[PDB]
Copies of this chain bind each other. A is one copy, B any other.
């Protein structure tokens, strides 16, 4: 049973984090914002209205929301304040979010694994795995 896009819908609470600091480092996030992001245990709320995907990132510090249509490039302002060109695709049971800015690129992959949502973030040689459970 391969995942679907609707399977990602829900309120998700962060439970585990590996390599997050090093990823935010590679992005250019200052120490201050890094220790602030790491102390947070966000909610990630995802809604899938057909191929219209909204991802709301909720914390006590900042709330960040983008809404896109699958496969249509859009302008994203990231939680760390980057202006990027982004495309979400659905590949092999995973929501793949590709960001480009300043000739740099990062990929965030969100997939369902064993009832959990696994978030993989790659920038250059820096990788990070976050694990979320369903609220």
Contacts and interface: CB of A to CB of B under 8 A. Distances in A.
Interface of A: 47, 49, 52, 54, 56, 62-67, 69, 72, 74-75, 77
Interface centre among A52, A56, A63, A67 (most CB of B within 10 A): A67
A108 B77 CA distance: 24
Q: Is the interface of A mostly helix, strand, loop or mixed?
A: strand
Copies of this subunit: 2
A62 to B, nearest CB: 8
Contacts of A65: 47, 49, 52, 54, 67
A50 to B, nearest CB: 9
Contacts of A49: 62-65
B77 A74 contact: no
A64 B52 contact: yes
